[PDB]
Coordinates of C-alpha atoms and ligand atoms in Angstrom, one line a residue:
Chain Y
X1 CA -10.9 9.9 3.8
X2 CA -14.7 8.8 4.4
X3 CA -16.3 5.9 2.5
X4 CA -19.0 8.1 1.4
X5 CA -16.4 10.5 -0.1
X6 CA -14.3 7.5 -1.8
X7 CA -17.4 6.2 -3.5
X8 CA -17.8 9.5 -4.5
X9 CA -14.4 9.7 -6.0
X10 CA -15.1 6.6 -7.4
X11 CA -18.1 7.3 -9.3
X12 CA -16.8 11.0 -10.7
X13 CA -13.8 9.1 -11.9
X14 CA -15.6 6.3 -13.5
X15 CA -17.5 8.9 -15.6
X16 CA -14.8 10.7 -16.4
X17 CA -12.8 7.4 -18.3
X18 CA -16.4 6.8 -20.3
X19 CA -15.8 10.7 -21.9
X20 CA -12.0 11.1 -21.7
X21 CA -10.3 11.5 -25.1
X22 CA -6.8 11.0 -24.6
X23 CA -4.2 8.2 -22.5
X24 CA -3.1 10.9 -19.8
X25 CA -6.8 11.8 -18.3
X26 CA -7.8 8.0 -18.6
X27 CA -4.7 6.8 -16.6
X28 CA -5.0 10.1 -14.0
X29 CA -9.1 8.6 -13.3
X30 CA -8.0 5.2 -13.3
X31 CA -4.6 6.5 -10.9
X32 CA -7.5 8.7 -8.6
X33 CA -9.9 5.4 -8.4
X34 CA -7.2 2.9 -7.1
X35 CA -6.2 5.8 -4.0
X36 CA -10.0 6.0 -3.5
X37 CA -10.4 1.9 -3.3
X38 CA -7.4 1.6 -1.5
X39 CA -8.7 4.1 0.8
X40 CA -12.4 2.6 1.7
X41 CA -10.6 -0.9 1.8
X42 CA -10.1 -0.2 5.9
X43 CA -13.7 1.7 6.3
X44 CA -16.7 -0.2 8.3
X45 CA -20.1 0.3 6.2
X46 CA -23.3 1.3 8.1
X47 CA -24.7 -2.0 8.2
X48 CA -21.8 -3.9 9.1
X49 CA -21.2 -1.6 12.3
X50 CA -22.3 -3.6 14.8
X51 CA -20.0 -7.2 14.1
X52 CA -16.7 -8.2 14.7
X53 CA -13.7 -6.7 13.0
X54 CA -12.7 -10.4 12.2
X55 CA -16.4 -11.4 11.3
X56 CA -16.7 -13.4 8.1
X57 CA -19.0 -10.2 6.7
X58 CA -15.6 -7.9 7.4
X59 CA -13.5 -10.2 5.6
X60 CA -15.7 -10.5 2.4
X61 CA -16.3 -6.8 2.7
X62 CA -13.0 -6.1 2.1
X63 CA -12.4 -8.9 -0.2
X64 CA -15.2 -6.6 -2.5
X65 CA -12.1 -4.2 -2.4
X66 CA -9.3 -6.2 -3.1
X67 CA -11.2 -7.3 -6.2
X68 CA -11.9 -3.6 -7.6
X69 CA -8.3 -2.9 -6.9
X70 CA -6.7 -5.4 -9.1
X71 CA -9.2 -4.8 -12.1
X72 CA -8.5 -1.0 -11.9
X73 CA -5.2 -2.0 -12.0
X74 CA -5.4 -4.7 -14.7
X75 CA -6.7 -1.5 -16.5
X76 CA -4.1 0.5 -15.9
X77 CA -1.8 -1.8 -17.4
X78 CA -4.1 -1.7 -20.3
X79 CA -3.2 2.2 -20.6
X80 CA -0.1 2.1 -20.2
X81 CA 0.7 0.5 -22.9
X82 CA -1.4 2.6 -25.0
X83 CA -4.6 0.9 -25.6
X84 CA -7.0 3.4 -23.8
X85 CA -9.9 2.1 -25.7
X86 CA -9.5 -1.9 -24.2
X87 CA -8.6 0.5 -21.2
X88 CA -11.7 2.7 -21.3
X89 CA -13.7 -1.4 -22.0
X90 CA -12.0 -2.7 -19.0
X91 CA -13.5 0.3 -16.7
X92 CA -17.0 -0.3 -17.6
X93 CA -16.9 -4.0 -17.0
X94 CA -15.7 -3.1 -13.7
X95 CA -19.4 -2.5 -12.9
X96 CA -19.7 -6.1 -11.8
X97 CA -18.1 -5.0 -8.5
X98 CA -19.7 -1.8 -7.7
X99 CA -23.2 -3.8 -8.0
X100 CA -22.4 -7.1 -6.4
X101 CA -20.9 -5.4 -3.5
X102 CA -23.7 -2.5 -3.1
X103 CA -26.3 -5.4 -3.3
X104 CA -25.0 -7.1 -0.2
X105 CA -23.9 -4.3 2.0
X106 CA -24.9 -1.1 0.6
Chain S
X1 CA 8.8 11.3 -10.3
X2 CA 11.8 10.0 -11.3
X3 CA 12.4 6.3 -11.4
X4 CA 15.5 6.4 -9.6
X5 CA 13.1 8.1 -6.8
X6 CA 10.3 5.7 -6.7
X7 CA 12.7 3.1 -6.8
X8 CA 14.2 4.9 -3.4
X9 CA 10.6 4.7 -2.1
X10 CA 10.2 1.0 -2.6
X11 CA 13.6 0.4 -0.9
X12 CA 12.9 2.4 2.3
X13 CA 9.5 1.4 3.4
X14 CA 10.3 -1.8 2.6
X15 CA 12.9 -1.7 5.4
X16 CA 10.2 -0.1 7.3
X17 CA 7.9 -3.1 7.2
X18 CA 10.6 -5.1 8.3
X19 CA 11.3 -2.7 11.5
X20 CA 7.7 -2.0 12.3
X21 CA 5.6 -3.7 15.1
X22 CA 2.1 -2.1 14.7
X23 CA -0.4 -3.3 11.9
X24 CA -0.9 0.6 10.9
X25 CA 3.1 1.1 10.5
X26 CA 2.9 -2.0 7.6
X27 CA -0.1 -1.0 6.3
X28 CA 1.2 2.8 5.4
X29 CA 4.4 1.4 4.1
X30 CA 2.4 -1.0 1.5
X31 CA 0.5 1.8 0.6
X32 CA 3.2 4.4 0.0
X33 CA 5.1 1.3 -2.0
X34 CA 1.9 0.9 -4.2
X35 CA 1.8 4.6 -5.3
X36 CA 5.4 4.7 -5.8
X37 CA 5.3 1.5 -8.2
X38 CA 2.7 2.9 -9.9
X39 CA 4.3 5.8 -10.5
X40 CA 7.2 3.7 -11.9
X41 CA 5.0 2.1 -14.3
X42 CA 5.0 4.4 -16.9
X43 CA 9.0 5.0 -16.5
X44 CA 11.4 4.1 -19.2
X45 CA 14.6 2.7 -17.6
X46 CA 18.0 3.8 -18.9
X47 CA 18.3 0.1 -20.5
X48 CA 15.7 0.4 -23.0
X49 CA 16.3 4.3 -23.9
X50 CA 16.5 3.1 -27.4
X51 CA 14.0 0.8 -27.7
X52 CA 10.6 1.6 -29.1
X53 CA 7.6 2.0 -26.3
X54 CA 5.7 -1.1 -28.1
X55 CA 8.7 -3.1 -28.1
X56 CA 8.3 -6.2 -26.2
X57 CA 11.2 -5.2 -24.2
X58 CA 8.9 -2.3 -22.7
X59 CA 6.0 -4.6 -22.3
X60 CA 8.0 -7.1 -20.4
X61 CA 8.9 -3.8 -18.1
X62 CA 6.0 -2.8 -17.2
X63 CA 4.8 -6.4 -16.7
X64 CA 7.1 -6.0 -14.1
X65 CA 5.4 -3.3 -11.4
X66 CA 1.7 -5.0 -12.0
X67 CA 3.4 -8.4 -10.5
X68 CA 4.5 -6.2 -8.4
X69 CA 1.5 -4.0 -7.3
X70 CA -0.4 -7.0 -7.1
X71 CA 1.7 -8.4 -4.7
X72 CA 1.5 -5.0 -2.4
X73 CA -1.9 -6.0 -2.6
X74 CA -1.8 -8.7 -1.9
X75 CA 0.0 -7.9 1.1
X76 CA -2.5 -5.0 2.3
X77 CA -5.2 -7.6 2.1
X78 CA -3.7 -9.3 5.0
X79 CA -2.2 -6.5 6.5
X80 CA -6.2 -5.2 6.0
X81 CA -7.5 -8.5 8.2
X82 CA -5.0 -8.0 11.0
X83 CA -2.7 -10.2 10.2
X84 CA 0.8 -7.8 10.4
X85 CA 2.9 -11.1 10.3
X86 CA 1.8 -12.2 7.3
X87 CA 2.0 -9.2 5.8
X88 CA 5.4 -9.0 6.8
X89 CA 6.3 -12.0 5.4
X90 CA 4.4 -11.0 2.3
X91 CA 6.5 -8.0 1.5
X92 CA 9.3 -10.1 2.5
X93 CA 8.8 -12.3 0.0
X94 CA 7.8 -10.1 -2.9
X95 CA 11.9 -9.5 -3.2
X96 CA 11.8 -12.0 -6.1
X97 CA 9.8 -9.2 -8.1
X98 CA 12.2 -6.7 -7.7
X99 CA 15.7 -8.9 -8.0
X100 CA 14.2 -10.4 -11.5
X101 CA 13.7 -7.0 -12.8
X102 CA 17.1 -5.7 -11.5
X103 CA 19.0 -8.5 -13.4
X104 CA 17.1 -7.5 -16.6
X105 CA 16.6 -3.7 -16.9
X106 CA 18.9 -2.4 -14.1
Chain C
X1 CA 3.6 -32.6 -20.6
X2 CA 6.1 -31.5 -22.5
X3 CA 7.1 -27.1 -23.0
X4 CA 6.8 -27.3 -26.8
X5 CA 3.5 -29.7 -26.2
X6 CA 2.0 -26.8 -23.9
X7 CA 3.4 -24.4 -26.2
X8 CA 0.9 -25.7 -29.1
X9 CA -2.0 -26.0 -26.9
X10 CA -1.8 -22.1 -25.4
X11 CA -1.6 -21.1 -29.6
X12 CA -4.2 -23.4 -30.6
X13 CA -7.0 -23.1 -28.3
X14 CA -6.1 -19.2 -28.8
X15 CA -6.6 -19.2 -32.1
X16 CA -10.4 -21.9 -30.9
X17 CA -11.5 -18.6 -29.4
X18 CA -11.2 -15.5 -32.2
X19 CA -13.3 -18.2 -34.1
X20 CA -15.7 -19.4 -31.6
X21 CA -19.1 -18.6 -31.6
X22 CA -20.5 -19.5 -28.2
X23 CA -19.7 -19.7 -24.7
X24 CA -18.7 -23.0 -24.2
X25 CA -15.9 -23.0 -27.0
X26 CA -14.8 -19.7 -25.5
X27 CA -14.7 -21.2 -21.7
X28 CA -13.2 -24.7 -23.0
X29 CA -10.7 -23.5 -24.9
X30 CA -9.7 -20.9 -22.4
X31 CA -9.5 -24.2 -19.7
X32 CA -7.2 -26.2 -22.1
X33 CA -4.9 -22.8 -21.8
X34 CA -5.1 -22.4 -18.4
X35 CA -4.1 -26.5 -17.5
X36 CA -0.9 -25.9 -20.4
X37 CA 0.0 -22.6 -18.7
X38 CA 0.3 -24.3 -15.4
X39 CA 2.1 -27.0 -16.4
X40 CA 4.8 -25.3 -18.7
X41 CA 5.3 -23.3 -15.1
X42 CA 7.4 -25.6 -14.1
X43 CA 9.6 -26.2 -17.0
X44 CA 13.2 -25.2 -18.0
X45 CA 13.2 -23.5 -21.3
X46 CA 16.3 -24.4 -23.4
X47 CA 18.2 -21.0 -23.5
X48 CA 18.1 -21.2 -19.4
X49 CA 18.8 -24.9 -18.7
X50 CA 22.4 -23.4 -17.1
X51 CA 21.3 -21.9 -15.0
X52 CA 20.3 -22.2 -11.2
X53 CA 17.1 -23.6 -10.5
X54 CA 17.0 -20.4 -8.4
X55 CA 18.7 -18.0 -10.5
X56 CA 16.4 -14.2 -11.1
X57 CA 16.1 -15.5 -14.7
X58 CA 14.2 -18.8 -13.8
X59 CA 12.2 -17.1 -11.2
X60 CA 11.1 -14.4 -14.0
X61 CA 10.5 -17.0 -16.4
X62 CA 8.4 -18.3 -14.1
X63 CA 6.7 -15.0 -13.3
X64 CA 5.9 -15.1 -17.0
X65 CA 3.5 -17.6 -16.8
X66 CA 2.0 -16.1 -13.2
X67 CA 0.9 -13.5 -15.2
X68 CA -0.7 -15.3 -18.4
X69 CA -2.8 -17.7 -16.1
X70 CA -4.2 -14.6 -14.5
X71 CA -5.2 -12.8 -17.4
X72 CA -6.7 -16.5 -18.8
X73 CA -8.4 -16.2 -15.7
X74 CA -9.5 -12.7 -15.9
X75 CA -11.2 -14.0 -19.2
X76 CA -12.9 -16.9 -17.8
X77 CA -14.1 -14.1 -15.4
X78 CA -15.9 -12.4 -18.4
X79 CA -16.7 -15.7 -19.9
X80 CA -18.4 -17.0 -16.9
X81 CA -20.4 -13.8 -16.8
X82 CA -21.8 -14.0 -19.8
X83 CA -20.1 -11.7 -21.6
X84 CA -18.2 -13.5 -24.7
X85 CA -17.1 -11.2 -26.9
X86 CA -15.1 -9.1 -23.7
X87 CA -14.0 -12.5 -23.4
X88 CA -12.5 -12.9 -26.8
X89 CA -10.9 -9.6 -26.7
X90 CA -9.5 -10.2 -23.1
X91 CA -7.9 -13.9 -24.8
X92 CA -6.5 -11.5 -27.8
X93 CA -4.9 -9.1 -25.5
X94 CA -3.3 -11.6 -23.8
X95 CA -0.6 -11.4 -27.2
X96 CA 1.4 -9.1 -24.8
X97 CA 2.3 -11.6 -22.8
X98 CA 3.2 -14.5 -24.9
X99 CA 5.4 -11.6 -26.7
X100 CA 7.1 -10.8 -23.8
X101 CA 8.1 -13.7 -22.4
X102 CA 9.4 -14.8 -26.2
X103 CA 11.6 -12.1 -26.7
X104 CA 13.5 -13.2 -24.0
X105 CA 13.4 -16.9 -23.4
X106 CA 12.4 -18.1 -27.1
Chain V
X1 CA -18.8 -32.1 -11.6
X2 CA -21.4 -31.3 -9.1
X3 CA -20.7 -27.8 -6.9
X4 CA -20.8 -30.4 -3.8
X5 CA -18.2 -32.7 -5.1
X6 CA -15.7 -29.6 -6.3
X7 CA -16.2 -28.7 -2.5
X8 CA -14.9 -31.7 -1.4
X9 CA -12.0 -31.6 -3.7
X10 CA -11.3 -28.5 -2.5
X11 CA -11.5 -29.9 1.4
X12 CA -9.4 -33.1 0.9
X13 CA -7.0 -31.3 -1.2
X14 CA -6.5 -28.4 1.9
X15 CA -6.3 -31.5 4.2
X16 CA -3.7 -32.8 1.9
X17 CA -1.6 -29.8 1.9
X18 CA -1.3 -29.1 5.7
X19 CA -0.2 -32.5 6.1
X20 CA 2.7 -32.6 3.4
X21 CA 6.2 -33.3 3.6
X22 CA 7.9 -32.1 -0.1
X23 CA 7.0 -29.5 -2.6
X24 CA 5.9 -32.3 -5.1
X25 CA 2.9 -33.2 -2.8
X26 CA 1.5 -29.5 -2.5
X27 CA 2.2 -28.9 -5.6
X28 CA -0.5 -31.1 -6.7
X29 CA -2.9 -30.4 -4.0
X30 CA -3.3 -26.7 -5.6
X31 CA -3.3 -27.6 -9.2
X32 CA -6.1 -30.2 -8.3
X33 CA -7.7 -27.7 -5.8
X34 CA -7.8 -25.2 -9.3
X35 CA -9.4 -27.0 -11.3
X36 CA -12.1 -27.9 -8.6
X37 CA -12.4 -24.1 -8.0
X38 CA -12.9 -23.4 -12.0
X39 CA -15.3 -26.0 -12.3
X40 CA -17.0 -25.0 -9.5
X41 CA -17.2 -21.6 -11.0
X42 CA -20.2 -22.5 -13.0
X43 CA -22.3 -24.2 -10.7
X44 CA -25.2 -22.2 -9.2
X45 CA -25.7 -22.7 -5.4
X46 CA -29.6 -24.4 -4.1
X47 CA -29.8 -20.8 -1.4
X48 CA -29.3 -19.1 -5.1
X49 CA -31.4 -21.4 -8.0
X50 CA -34.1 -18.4 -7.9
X51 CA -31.9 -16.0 -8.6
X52 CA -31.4 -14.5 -12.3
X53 CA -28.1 -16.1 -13.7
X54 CA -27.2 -12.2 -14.2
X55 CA -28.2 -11.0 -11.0
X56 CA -25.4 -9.2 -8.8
X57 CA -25.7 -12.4 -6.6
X58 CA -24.6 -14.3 -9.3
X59 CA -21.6 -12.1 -10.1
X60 CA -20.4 -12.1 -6.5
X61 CA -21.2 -16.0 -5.9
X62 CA -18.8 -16.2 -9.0
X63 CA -16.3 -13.6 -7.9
X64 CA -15.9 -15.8 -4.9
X65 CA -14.3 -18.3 -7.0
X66 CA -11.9 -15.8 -8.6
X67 CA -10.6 -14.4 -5.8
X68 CA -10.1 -18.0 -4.5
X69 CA -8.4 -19.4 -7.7
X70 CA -5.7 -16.0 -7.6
X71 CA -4.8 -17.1 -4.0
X72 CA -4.4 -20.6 -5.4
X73 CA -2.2 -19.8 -8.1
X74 CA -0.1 -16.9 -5.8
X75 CA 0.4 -20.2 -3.5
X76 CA 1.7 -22.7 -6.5
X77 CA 3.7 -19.3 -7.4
X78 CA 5.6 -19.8 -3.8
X79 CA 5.5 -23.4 -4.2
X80 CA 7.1 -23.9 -8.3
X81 CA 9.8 -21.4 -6.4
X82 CA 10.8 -24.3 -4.0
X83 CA 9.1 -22.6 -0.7
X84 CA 6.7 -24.8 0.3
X85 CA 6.7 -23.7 3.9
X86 CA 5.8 -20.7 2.7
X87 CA 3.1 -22.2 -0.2
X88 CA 1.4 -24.0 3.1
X89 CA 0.8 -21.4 4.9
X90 CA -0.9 -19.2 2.0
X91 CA -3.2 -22.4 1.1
X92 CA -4.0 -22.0 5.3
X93 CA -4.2 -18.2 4.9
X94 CA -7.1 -18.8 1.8
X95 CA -9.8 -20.1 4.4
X96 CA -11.2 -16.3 4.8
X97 CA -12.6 -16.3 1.0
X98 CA -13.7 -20.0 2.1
X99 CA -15.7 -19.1 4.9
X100 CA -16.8 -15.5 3.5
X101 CA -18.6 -17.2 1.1
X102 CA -19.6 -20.0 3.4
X103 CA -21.7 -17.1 5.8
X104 CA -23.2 -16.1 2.3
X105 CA -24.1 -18.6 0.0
X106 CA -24.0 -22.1 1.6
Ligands
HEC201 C1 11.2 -3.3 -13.1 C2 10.0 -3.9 -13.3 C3 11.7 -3.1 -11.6 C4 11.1 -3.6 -10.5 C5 10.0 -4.6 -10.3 C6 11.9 -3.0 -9.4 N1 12.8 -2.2 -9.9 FE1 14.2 -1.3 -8.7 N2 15.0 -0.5 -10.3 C7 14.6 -0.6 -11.6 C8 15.5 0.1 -12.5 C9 15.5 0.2 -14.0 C10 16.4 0.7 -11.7 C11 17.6 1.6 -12.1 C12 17.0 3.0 -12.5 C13 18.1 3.9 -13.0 O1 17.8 5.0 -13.5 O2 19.3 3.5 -12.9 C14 16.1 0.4 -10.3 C15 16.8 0.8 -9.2 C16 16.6 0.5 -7.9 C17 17.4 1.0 -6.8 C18 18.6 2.0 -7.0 C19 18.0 3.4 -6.7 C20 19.1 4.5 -6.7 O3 18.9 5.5 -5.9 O4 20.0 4.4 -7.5 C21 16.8 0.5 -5.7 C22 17.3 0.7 -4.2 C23 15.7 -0.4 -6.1 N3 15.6 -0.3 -7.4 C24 14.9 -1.1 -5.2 C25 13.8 -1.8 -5.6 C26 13.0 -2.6 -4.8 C27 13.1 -2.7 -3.3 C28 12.1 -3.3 -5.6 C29 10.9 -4.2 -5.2 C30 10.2 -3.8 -4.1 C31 12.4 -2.9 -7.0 N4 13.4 -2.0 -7.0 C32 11.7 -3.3 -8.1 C33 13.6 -1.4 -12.1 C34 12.7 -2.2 -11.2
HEC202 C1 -18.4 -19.5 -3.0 C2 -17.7 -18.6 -3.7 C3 -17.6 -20.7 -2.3 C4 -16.3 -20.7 -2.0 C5 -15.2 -19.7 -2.2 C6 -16.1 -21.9 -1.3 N1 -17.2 -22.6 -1.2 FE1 -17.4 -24.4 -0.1 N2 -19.3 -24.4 -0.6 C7 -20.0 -23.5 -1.3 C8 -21.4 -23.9 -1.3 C9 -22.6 -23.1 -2.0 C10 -21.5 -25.0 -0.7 C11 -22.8 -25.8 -0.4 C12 -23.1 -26.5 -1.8 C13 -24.4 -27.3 -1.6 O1 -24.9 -27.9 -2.6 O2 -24.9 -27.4 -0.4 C14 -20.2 -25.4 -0.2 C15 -19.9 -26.5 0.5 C16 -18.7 -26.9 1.0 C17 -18.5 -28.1 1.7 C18 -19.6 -29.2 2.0 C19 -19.4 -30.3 1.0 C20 -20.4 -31.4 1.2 O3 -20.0 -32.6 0.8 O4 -21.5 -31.2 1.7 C21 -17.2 -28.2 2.0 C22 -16.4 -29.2 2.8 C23 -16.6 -27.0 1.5 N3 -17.5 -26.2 0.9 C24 -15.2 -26.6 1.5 C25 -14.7 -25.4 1.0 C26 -13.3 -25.0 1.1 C27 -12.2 -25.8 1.8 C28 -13.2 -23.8 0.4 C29 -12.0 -23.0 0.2 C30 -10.8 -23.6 -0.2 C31 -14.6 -23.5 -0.1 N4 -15.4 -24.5 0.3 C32 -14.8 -22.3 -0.8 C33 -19.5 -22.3 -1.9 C34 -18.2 -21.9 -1.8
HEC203 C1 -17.8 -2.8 -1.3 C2 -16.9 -3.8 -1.6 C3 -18.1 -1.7 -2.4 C4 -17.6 -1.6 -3.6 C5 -16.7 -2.6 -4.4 C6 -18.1 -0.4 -4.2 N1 -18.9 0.2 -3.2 FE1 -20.1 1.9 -3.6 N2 -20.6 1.9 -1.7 C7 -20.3 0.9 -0.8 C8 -21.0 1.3 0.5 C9 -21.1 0.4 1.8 C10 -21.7 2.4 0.2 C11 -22.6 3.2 1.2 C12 -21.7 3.9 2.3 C13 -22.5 4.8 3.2 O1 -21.9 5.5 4.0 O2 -23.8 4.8 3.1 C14 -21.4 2.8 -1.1 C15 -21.9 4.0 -1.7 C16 -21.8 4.4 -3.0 C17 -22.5 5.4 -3.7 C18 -23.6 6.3 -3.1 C19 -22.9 7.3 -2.2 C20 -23.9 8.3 -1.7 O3 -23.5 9.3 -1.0 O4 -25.1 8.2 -2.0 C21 -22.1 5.4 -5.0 C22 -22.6 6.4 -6.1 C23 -21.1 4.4 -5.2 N3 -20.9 3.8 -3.9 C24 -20.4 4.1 -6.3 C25 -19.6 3.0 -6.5 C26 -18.9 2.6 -7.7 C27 -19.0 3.3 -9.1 C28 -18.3 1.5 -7.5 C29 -17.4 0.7 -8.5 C30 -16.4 1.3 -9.1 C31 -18.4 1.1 -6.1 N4 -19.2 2.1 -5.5 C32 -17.9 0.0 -5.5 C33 -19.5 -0.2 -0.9 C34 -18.9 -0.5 -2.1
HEC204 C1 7.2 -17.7 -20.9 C2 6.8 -17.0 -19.8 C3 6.3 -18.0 -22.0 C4 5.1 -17.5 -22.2 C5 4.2 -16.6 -21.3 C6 4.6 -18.0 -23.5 N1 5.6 -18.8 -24.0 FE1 5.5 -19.6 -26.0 N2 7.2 -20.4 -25.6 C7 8.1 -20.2 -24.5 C8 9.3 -20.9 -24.8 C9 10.6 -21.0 -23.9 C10 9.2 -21.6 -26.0 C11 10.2 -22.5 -26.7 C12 10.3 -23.8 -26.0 C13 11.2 -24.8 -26.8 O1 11.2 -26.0 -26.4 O2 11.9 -24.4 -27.7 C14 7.9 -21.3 -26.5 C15 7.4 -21.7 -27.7 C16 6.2 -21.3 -28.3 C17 5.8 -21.6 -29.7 C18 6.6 -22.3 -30.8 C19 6.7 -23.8 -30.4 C20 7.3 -24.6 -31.5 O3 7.3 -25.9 -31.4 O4 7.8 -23.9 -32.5 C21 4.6 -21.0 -29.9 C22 3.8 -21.1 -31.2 C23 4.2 -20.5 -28.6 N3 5.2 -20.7 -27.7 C24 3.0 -19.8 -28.4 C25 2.7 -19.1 -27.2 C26 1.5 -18.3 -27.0 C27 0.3 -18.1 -28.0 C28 1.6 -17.7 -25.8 C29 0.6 -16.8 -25.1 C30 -0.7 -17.3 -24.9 C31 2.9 -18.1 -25.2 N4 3.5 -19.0 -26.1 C32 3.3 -17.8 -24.0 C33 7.8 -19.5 -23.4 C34 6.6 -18.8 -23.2
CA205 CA1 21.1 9.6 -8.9
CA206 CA1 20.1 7.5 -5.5
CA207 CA1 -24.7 -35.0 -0.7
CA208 CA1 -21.0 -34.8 0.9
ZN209 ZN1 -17.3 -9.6 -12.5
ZN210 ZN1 8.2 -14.7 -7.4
ZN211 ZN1 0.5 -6.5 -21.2
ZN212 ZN1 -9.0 -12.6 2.9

């Protein structure tokens, strides 16, 4: 889909983990978040349009991705064994991301 | 879905990226193997029926598809830069996931 | 050093951090763990020593402690930001790991 | 140590491994090449000393190093399975989180 759409995505789901109640909606956000991330990984931002595909920017802009992805997912393996609070913990420190890559290229 | 069919999933588009010539023929395998793994997370193989879902034994399972995933991932990240013989050579390699598994729990 | 060595240092610098107080006992202890967990990875366990040094069993013995030095890492992470106490909890749920791994190889 | 000799760690250490003959030698290139990265961790950067220790430049100097230190490890996974060819070509493939955060920070 479209980068602003993911980050859209990512942003409903985010707020639906801080007010879920149960495993089974935290593990569907956290499920809807990785597609989303996985998604933007391959997108060009508006102000990185005009360099290379291989420029160092590129790279660390996708890098920014790669690192959301694997703490979503250390998350999920947080909920699936059944700890959706540490689960529910693990998606708010993920903020660290959002805010060091909007920063630099949002 | 069922394990058996996520484990089908991995199997073919693994054989895809070791058939495909075209970065965007790797990258959709490594993304259909991702949701498919994750998928197969929160399976409970035949093996361990009887075992309780806190037990070690099911920890040590699921340990299994985060190595996993993050080794998808860490094949799309190259597959994400360009670099379609790496990536090919990542999935190639990430066979040591499944086979220790298999000898365990299959 | 030695498996049983690197074995006492993971469980005592663990036990460093749920009674630390700052960060630097937090992100020193969580070093010592990460320097034993890298060099019990390339160890032979008594209940595997017959088998190949390629066998699924060694390479998912090995896998085991993959996964532990990321997680120490994914604390250090949370250490090195600042935050101490998510620190602490991240060391604690490590558990799952060094459960795992015990159940099969201890 | 100081952020500039960790940097030259890392550089000898990369030298080091493109140049080896057994698994022994890059073996120890990464381990030392891991612990120069985790030190390094720490350090604040002169094009940063301004900056709040908790501002997102901070958190993505230091996510730098995390990404770095998981490719590290996923490399000393390859080579404590015997594949060093393959353990010298991911060190080589690293040098995009190298110079991503070269164009930012140094
Ligand atoms: C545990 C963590 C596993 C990992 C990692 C992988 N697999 Fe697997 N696989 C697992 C089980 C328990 C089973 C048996 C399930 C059952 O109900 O019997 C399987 C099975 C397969 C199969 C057989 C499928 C069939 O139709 O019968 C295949 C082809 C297969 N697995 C492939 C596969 C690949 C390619 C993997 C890595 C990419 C992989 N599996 C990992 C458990 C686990
Ligand atoms: C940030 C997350 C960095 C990563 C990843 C890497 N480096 Fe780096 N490096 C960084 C800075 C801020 C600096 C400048 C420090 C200063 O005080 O000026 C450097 C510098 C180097 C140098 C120069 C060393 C010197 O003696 O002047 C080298 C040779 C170097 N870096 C190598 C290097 C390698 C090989 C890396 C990946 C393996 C790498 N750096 C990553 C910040 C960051
Ligand atoms: C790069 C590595 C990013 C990461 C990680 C996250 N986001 Fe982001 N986001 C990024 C860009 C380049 C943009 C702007 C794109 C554009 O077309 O202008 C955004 C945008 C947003 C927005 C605002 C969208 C809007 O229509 O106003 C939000 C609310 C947002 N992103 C949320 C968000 C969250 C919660 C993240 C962490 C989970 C996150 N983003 C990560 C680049 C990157
Ligand atoms: C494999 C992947 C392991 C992981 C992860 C952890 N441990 Fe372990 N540990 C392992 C083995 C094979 C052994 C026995 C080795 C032997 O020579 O007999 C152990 C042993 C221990 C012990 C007891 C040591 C003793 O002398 O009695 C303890 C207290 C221990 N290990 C702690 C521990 C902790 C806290 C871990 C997580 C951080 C952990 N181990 C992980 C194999 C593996
Ligand atoms: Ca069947
Ligand atoms: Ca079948
Ligand atoms: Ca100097
Ligand atoms: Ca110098
Ligand atoms: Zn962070
Ligand atoms: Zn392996
Ligand atoms: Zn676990
Ligand atoms: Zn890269």
């Amino acid at each position: 889909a479209d980068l602003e759409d993911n980050m859209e995505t990512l942003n409903d789901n985010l707020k639906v983990i801080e007010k879920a109640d149960n495993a089974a909606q935290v593990k569907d956000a956290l499920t809807k978040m990785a597609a989303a991330a996985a998604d933007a990984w391959s997108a060009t931002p508006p102000k990185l349009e005009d360099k290379s595909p291989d420029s160092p920017e590129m790279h660390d802009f996708r890098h920014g991705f790669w690192i959301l992805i694997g703490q979503i997912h250390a998350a999920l393996h947080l909920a699936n064994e059944g700890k959706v609070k540490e689960a529910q913990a693990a998606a708010e420190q993920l903020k660290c991301t959002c805010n060091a890559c909007h920063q630099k290229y949002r």
